[PDB]
Design a protein around this ligand. Structure first.
Ligand SMILES: *[C@@H]1O[C@H](CO)[C@@H](O[C@@H]2O[C@H](CO)[C@@H](O[C@@H]3O[C@H](CO[C@H]4O[C@H](CO)[C@@H](O)[C@H](O)[C@@H]4O[C@@H]4O[C@H](CO)[C@@H](O)[C@H](O)[C@H]4NC(C)=O)[C@@H](O)[C@H](O)[C@@H]3O)[C@H](O)[C@H]2NC(C)=O)[C@H](O[C@H]2O[C@@H](C)[C@@H](O)[C@@H](O)[C@@H]2O)[C@H]1NC(C)=O
Ligand SMILES: *[C@@H]1O[C@H](CO)[C@@H](O[C@@H]2O[C@H](CO)[C@@H](O[C@@H]3O[C@H](CO)[C@@H](O)[C@H](O)[C@@H]3O)[C@H](O)[C@H]2NC(C)=O)[C@H](O)[C@H]1NC(C)=O
Ligand code: NAG
Ligand code: G2F
Length: 602
């Protein structure tokens, strides 16, 4: 007879109910499982009724794969899932946090902290639009973004994934969501999930909640603060995500007053679902439930019980799916977890899939392949990079002539530094590899390349990664552009207590600047000790992690556009002042939040 859930002209809620009512326990728990592509097989997917797959940092078909290669991979997995008794399409997720960054050739946009310095939510929205297209260009339909954490301690290795230390700024940047999913209708109810269609992707507000508030910025640690600050600082942005229809929400590895988020039923179910009225689905983080216990995974049985009863709907296993499914099944069979919990979880996952049209368009669109790395997207990225630059100094003294903008026509100029010609460094974490990488790992333009592409034909451009003082003094340079900074990092590998840039760095700047007037470009994912660098430089620009379009940097250095970016964080004088955020008690910043020198286009 007629099958309601397969009828596209029917309301989403009716389709969810109809399908849910035909599912076996195995099929229900299957929808709740998300596995890594590395352990997926047509059989595994079909036999276990897997509801979702993901690609972790660096998890790719093969180095340098094309958009078609990705599309074929995703489609392959989808066909297996479509072959099940109910034919429920799987939703493939990935970390497209500053472009479709795992993919070779994808446009790499500036990381969040930089986007916060632009104070342009519309720009960010546009970035989200370009990003969805490039993700769909690879056949993926779900992006684990935006990370709306409010980093309150720069020592956190994920601070660069935070728009600001000021919730107000982070709230405004939730505009990435409508960019990724598309704008919600005017009638729209806050809390409901939404995705315009096959040319958009499901978004993910992460990490619920207070991930940007761990002590000493220690990742995945404990966030000690009253519900007053929790709700005043780290919660706001989520309410905005609810109003903009964010499809999913990922839970943080961190704890709140000693309680693991992945086990906090009060927050996940009591607040996020019951209070905020979130209707989409709640997903876990990579082995998030394993880490509920300590040692991690030392009681997976407990992990499944706590997490599921806490309110999570989909678990990012992402490897031992057999163990996960076996255990969750046992708990249900034993009454430890009620069918209502399972039904609710499956209701939310299906709601999201139906809403985004997954049942209508389960497969990738070849026509979308060209979206990957499309020049327009790169131009957009270029604009964002330019706008994210924060000029901190532009002259050694009040009477010095401002060094920036530099002249495009000069007899001979020096470009130097470890970061002057290193595309990987310039992109930072979450680029090709999980931890990011060094060198030419994808398509883009380094600062050196951008310089050469900007100067007048007559301007001789010399490159020296680490020239000594004499080399500079004898080179007859008119000026020099020196780029230095942090190395790529992600999550815990990024935790840093001293926050000083690696060498050679300061030394190169001092050597170069000692010999000729210099413009130092600082590449970092957060504010770092900068008095020494400042002392030696004539002009110093905070470029954060620009992305693949380095010309965004030269667009400002040479005056095609004036600097407009403003510090989205507090620049400290010393690390032992930390934490220290705007509105604090002893606020004694080297540069207060909102600071930024300007220039006008020549
Ligand atoms: C402040 O505290 C942080 C850590 O909390 C410290 O930086 C970390 O230092 C760790 C060791 O002390 C280091 O861990 C080791 O890493 C070795 C390999 O490290 C290279 O490769 C990784 C990526 O694979 C990069 O992230 C590293 O930065 C490093 O990269 C090379 O760095 C050199 C020097 O600038 C450069 O010339 C190379 O071109 C560059 N190559 C690459 C890959 O790009 C590994 O073999 C060890 O087993 C061990 O795991 C950890 O990676 C690093 N954290 C990061 C992400 O930077 C700060 O500074 C230290 O930096 C290291 C590199 C070294 O210079 C130390 O002398 C510095 O103290 C701390 N600052 C201070 C003042 O203590
Ligand atoms: C926040 O981070 C701190 C680390 O600074 C966590 O505390 C630390 O916990 C680890 C283990 O959980 C302890 O290390 C050692 O682990 C081995 C494991 O085999 C064990 O054999 C040793 O006896 C020892 O426990 C470490 O001592 C401890 N350090 C601190 C800070 O006291 C803390 O648990 C984290 N908070 C949360 C819940 O996120
Ligand atoms: C120069 O830049 C400032 C701020 O960046 C701006 O307010 C001002 O209008 C600009 N001047 C001109 C003439 O465009
Ligand atoms: C855990 O893993 C997921 C998927 O790779 C990331 O999106 C989270 O930020 C990380 F904490």
């Amino acid at each position: 007879d007629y099958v309601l859930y397969k009828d596209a002209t029917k309301p989403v809620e009716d389709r969810v109910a109809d399908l849910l009512g035909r599912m076996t326990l195995a099929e229900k728990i299957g929808q709740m499982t998300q596995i890594e592509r590395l352990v997926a097989t047509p059989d595994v997917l079909r036999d276990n009724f897997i509801g979702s797959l993901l690609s972790g940092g660096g998890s790719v078909p093969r180095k340098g794969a094309t958009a078609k290669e990705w599309q074929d991979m995703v489609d392959g997995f989808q066909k297996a899932c479509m072959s099940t008794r109910l034919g429920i399409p799987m939703i493939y997720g990935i970390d497209a946090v500053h472009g479709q960054n795992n993919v070779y050739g994808a446009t790499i946009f500036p990381h969040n902290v930089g986007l916060g310095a632009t104070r342009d939510p519309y720009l960010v929205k546009r970035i989200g639009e370009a990003t969805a297209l490039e993700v769909r260009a690879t056949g993926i339909q779900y992006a684990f973004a935006p990370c709306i954490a409010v980093c309150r301690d720069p020592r956190w290795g994920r601070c660069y994934e935070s728009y600001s230390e000021d919730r107000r700024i982070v709230q405004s940047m939730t505009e990435l969501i409508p960019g990724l999913q598309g704008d919600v209708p005017k009638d729209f109810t806050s809390g409901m999930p939404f995705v315009a269609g096959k040319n958009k992707v499901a978004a993910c507000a992460k990490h619920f909640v207070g991930d940007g508030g761990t002590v000493d910025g220690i990742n995945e640690n404990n966030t000690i603060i009253n519900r007053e600050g929790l709700m005043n600082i780290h919660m706001p942005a989520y309410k905005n995500a609810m109003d903009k229809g964010v499809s999913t929400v990922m839970i943080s590895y961190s704890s709140w007053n000693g309680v693991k988020m992945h086990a906090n039923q009060d927050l996940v179910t009591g607040y996020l679902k019951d209070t905020l009225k979130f209707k989409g689905f709640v997903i876990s983080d990579w082995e998030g439930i394993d880490r509920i216990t300590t040692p991690a995974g030392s009681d997976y049985s407990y992990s499944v019980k706590a997490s599921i009863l806490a309110g999570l709907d989909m678990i990012m296993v992402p490897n031992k799916y057999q163990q996960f499914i076996s255990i969750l099944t046992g708990h249900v069979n034993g009454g430890v977890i009620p069918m209502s919990r399972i039904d609710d979880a499956v209701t939310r996952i299906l709601r999201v899939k139906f809403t985004m049209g997954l049942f209508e368009n389960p497969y990738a669109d070849p026509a979308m392949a060209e979206q990957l790395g499309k020049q327009e997207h790169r131009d957009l990225a270029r604009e964002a990079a330019r706008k994210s630059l924060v000029l901190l100094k532009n002259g050694k003294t009040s009477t010095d002539a401002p060094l920036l903008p530099l002249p495009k026509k000069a007899p001979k100029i020096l470009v130097a530094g470890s970061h002057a010609d290193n595309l990987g460094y310039q992109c930072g974490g979450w680029t090709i590899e999980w931890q990011g990488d060094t060198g030419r790992t994808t398509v883009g333009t380094t600062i050196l390349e951008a310089v050469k592409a900007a100067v007048d034909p007559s301007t001789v451009v010399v490159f020296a990664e680490n020239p000594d003082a004499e080399f500079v003094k004898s080179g007859g340079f008119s000026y020099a552009i020196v780029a230095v900074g942090e190395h790529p990092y992600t999550e815990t590998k990024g935790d840093n207590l001293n926050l000083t840039i690696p060498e050679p760095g300061l030394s190169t700047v001092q050597a170069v600047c000692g010999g000729v007037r210099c413009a130092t470009v600082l590449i970092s994912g957060r504010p770092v000790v900068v008095q020494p660098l400042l002392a030696a430089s004539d002009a110093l620009v905070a470029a954060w992690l620009p992305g693949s379009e380095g010309q965004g940097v030269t667009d400002a250095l040479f005056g095609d556009f004036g600097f407009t970016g403003r510090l989205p964080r507090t620049w400290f004088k010393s690390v032992d002042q930390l934490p220290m955020n705007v509105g604090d008690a002893h606020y004694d910043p080297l540069f207060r939040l909102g600071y930024g020198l300007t220039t006008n286009a020549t």
